């Protein structure tokens, strides 16, 4: 894990998931607050995943593969989102610098996949 994956970015964001049944965003992991969100590159397989942990209690709130061809939506300068076959994820970044860091890394991953 540490043997196989390298972080390519870390950004400060409140990680949300979309409750489509209720038509509203809810905090990932059930607890509002900011997380440190990484993109990890598994260099052996050339695969990537998003992993986020709450700053306070370190709970893992997001751990999702980045599939080839993903459409990454920069809705605003500080809120970005994407979806999989299961969930819609949203990142409410702590600053535009954090958003640029994460988007830059996500776009690199999507070029490299």
């Amino acid at each position: 894990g540490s043997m196989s994956e390298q972080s390519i970015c870390q950004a400060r964001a409140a990680v949300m998931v979309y409750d489509d049944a209720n038509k509203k965003w809810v905090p990932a992991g059930g607890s509002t607050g900011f997380s440190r969100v990484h993109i990890y590159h598994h260099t052996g397989n050339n695969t990537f995943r998003v992993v986020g942990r709450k700053i306070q209690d370190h709970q893992v709130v997001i751990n999702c593969a980045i599939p080839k061809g993903l459409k990454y939506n920069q809705a605003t300068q500080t809120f970005h989102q994407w979806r999989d076959a299961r969930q819609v994820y949203g990142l409410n970044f702590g600053s535009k610098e954090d958003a640029n860091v994460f988007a830059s890394a996500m776009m690199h991953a999507l070029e490299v996949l």
């Binding site: 038509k23 949203g90 409410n92």
Partner: peptide
């Protein structure tokens, strides 16, 4: 994609 919160 749904609207931001």
């Amino acid at each position: 994609x749904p609207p931001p919160p």
